[PDB]
Design a protein around this motif. Structure first.
Motif, PDB file in Angstrom:
ATOM      1  N   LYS A   5      -0.058 -14.260 -10.307  1.00 16.31           N
ATOM      2  CA  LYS A   5      -0.501 -14.651 -11.643  1.00 16.31           C
ATOM      3  C   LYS A   5      -0.368 -13.503 -12.654  1.00 16.31           C
ATOM      4  CE  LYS A   5      -4.290 -16.819 -14.166  1.00 16.31           C
ATOM      5  NZ  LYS A   5      -5.752 -17.052 -14.176  1.00 16.31           N
ATOM      6  N   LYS A  48       0.840  -1.188   0.000  1.00 15.21           N
ATOM      7  CA  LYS A  48       0.000   0.000   0.000  1.00 15.21           C
ATOM      8  C   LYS A  48       0.878   1.242   0.000  1.00 15.21           C
ATOM      9  CE  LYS A  48      -4.450   1.426   1.958  1.00 15.21           C
ATOM     10  NZ  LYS A  48      -4.278   2.902   1.839  1.00 15.21           N
ATOM     11  N   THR A 107       4.568 -22.610  -9.194  1.00 16.17           N
ATOM     12  CA  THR A 107       3.352 -23.362  -8.916  1.00 16.17           C
ATOM     13  C   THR A 107       3.677 -24.737  -8.339  1.00 16.17           C
ATOM     14  OG1 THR A 107       2.249 -22.259 -10.780  1.00 16.17           O
ATOM     15  CG2 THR A 107       1.162 -24.170  -9.834  1.00 16.17           C
ATOM     16  N   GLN A 108       4.662 -25.418  -8.926  1.00 16.48           N
ATOM     17  CA  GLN A 108       5.009 -26.786  -8.523  1.00 16.48           C
ATOM     18  C   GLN A 108       5.632 -26.890  -7.132  1.00 16.48           C
ATOM     19  OE1 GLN A 108       5.385 -27.389 -13.071  1.00 16.48           O
ATOM     20  NE2 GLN A 108       7.322 -27.859 -12.031  1.00 16.48           N
ATOM     21  N   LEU A 149       4.123 -26.101  -4.471  1.00 17.87           N
ATOM     22  CA  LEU A 149       3.053 -26.495  -3.559  1.00 17.87           C
ATOM     23  C   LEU A 149       3.093 -27.994  -3.271  1.00 17.87           C
ATOM     24  CD1 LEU A 149       0.271 -24.414  -5.279  1.00 17.87           C
ATOM     25  CD2 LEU A 149       0.731 -24.202  -2.820  1.00 17.87           C
ATOM     26  N   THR A 150       3.403 -28.791  -4.294  1.00 19.02           N
ATOM     27  CA  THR A 150       3.421 -30.252  -4.174  1.00 19.02           C
ATOM     28  C   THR A 150       4.605 -30.771  -3.367  1.00 19.02           C
ATOM     29  OG1 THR A 150       4.753 -30.724  -6.154  1.00 19.02           O
ATOM     30  CG2 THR A 150       2.379 -30.396  -6.471  1.00 19.02           C
ATOM     31  N   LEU A 151       5.568 -29.896  -3.091  1.00 19.83           N
ATOM     32  CA  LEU A 151       6.778 -30.280  -2.366  1.00 19.83           C
ATOM     33  C   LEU A 151       6.557 -30.326  -0.854  1.00 19.83           C
ATOM     34  CD1 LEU A 151       8.049 -30.087  -5.102  1.00 19.83           C
ATOM     35  CD2 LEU A 151       9.707 -28.434  -4.206  1.00 19.83           C
ATOM     36  N   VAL A 208      -1.998 -20.873  -2.470  1.00 26.66           N
ATOM     37  CA  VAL A 208      -2.616 -20.917  -3.788  1.00 26.66           C
ATOM     38  C   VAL A 208      -3.381 -19.642  -4.059  1.00 26.66           C
ATOM     39  CG1 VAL A 208      -4.359 -22.014  -5.201  1.00 26.66           C
ATOM     40  CG2 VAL A 208      -2.757 -23.369  -3.901  1.00 26.66           C
ATOM     41  N   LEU A 238      -0.712 -17.264  -5.046  1.00 29.99           N
ATOM     42  CA  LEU A 238      -0.274 -17.685  -6.377  1.00 29.99           C
ATOM     43  C   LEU A 238      -1.178 -17.202  -7.522  1.00 29.99           C
ATOM     44  CD1 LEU A 238       1.925 -19.776  -7.689  1.00 29.99           C
ATOM     45  CD2 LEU A 238      -0.081 -21.249  -7.854  1.00 29.99           C
ATOM     46  N   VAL A 239      -2.492 -17.202  -7.287  1.00 31.58           N
ATOM     47  CA  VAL A 239      -3.481 -16.846  -8.311  1.00 31.58           C
ATOM     48  C   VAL A 239      -3.908 -15.369  -8.297  1.00 31.58           C
ATOM     49  CG1 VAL A 239      -5.791 -17.329  -9.202  1.00 31.58           C
ATOM     50  CG2 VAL A 239      -4.402 -19.184  -8.301  1.00 31.58           C
ATOM     51  N   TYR A 257       6.448 -19.363 -13.818  1.00 32.48           N
ATOM     52  CA  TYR A 257       5.180 -19.498 -13.119  1.00 32.48           C
ATOM     53  C   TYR A 257       4.843 -20.961 -12.875  1.00 32.48           C
ATOM     54  CZ  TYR A 257       0.419 -18.358 -11.713  1.00 32.48           C
ATOM     55  OH  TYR A 257      -0.751 -18.200 -11.008  1.00 32.48           O
ATOM     56  N   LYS A 258       5.199 -21.813 -13.832  1.00 31.19           N
ATOM     57  CA  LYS A 258       4.960 -23.248 -13.716  1.00 31.19           C
ATOM     58  C   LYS A 258       5.853 -23.851 -12.641  1.00 31.19           C
ATOM     59  CE  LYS A 258       3.777 -23.791 -18.666  1.00 31.19           C
ATOM     60  NZ  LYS A 258       4.046 -24.562 -19.912  1.00 31.19           N
ATOM     61  N   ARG A 272      -1.345 -24.020   2.729  1.00 35.47           N
ATOM     62  CA  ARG A 272      -1.409 -24.143   1.283  1.00 35.47           C
ATOM     63  C   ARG A 272      -2.641 -23.454   0.707  1.00 35.47           C
ATOM     64  NH1 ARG A 272       2.359 -29.024   0.818  1.00 35.47           N
ATOM     65  NH2 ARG A 272       1.164 -30.394   2.221  1.00 35.47           N
ATOM     66  N   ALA A 273      -3.704 -23.368   1.504  1.00 37.92           N
ATOM     67  CA  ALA A 273      -4.904 -22.643   1.108  1.00 37.92           C
ATOM     68  C   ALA A 273      -4.541 -21.225   0.667  1.00 37.92           C
ATOM     69  CB  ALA A 273      -5.912 -22.613   2.253  1.00 37.92           C
TER      70      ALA A 273
END
Lengths: 182, 9, 183, 179, 186
Positions: free
Chosen positions: E101, E54, E115-116, E118-120, E93, E96-97, E111-112, E89-90
């Motif tokens: 994004k 801000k 994104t990946q 999160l799975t780690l 993401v 992330l979006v 970006y890909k 993680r909620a």
């Protein structure tokens, strides 16, 4: 028929010997012929309230008589207390409305008092509950009441004892048919 | 020796 | 024994006739002797993925062979997709890591490409998933793929058809027994 | 000093003219010299509850007196009923305990009575709340109440009128210095 | 006017001397004449990413040039990584979006990769992020980078140093106006 009914019991014996635990208790529940105390007991201790109500529902509904009304209320009370204890006041309120509200008609004040436990920092501020120990002490101490409430329930009073019979009667009677698929 | 009204305790 | 085995079917038949629907399938599952196809479909349409996966567990685990592996994969993918459609990305993530991550070893690039569906405003931007029509139609088209995968699976191929026999066969045998061998 | 106090107003007027909307009000709140009734009115209509109480806290605490006591009460009461309307029973409770519970010592039964609004299908089934229309009305018919309450409150009574003075009085006095 | 502009500074000094800490910073922000570096470092360390973004928005938008673009990118990345650290993680993401994004069009493959993460099980399994030590250290070490990007950015380079002047300069000029003559009316 009385024939059908006693066949249930034989089958039950078999399943138990084949270590088909789940299938046994689905049968108990759906047939309504035998209420497995030691199974119920175990499920209460585990806090499996959705299953507990489901298994009970095979033998009685919430408003059937005075006994089973208190049995249900008691379960849905403890469910709400634990929700409170883990500070999940969201799930508590849900419980309060969906599960406990049906008992307000009978007891309007009691329901209000149960509703006011939501604003306390710890519901043991309420003197009638200042002795509630922990999850484990409370479930077992509630379990004790439930055994009594069940054994005094007329809808249960003829169903609690498994008629004793020879080991593997169903296998032996099947053998008598083979002596006598097809 | 049993008592089946509804309450907290 | 084969004795005990066949005895289960008699029971399965008795149960079905007494309208003990739940107990029927609990025995189908725990015994792993017969796979009720009409029940499975009913559950796949109902989106009972938990029950669906719990029912398959009585026959096969996720990594037993290639067919069962794609069976579980597809179900988890669909579960994953329905989560995206209600915009519950929180739930979608949970599924992606909890259930789906086990398939990453076998196909790293697919996992990544499936992962990236979170960041899409609508995962139909992916051309391979542009043919997702709705929840009903997608379960339906998938169900048909699932029937094929099951009927081909060696672990299932001999447990699909219920051995035909007399109505109330168990009640007959028992009524024999009341007549038999006490005389 | 009273010098410092009147210099603020100059600055305030200066700030308003330069269209520095946020700063003006931070200055109002932090200095506590002038209470911007129209600002307040705007926020209370707009439902910016955190911001409304933040602004207020610059001028009075909850327990300062009878009037400011009810003012915070009314705001928190609405903030609550609005949560019930949108069926957010989580937030309804969170507000019930964090925000409202401080008044229960003063009025026990009223508090219980407000609690029990959670177990209703629609709180308008309480006959004292049977005239609650929608958010927009209820905000405005409560705003009137606040306005009467603030204008009666001693801690505000001498801070509600902006002293009228010639435009850009701060730029003129700056000019007198360059001269 | 440059007159009005320099009057802002006097008010800033006064406001600061009156221990009106919050008002000071709102002015700095809305006027966009002075960027308080000490304050920026303070809020970055505290992690108030809503207040940090801000404060910057008073001086620049996300796509004004290369420097500011990367400043917003670094911030939002760290906000995203911390979310992965408390295992929310909620929110990760969501970040992330909503936040990250906007940088995909410019960096399609980065970006890909992000994104990946999160799975780690722990995003330090990525080699480039294997140095992320704790929250305090990575905030601090990124602050360093932000300082370089801010000082190099053309929109800030002339707004970083507070012009030194005599204390209570505004209180002095007011007295010269009172000597020349309440303050409201002569």
């Amino acid at each position: 028929s009385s024939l059908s009914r006693e066949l249930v019991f034989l089958i039950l014996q078999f399943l138990d010997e084949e270590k088909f635990k789940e299938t046994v208790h689905k049968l108990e529940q759906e047939s309504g012929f035998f209420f497995n105390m030691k199974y119920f007991e175990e499920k209460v201790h585990a806090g499996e309230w959705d299953e507990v109500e489901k298994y009970l529902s095979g033998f009685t509904k919430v408003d059937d008589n005075r006994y089973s009304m208190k049995i249900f209320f008691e379960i849905r009370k403890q469910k709400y207390l634990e929700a409170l204890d883990r500070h999940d006041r969201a799930k508590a309120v849900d419980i309060l409305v969906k599960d406990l509200k049906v008992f307000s008609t009978f007891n309007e004040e009691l329901y209000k008092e149960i509703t006011q436990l939501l604003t306390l920092e710890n519901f043991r501020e309420n003197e009638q509950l200042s002795k509630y120990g922990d999850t484990k002490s409370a479930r077992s101490i509630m379990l004790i009441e439930l055994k009594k409430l069940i054994e005094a329930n007329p809808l249960f009073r003829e169903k609690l004892v498994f008629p004793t019979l020879k080991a593997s009667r169903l296998r032996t009677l099947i053998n008598q048919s083979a002596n006598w698929t097809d | 020796d049993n008592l089946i009204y509804l309450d907290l305790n």
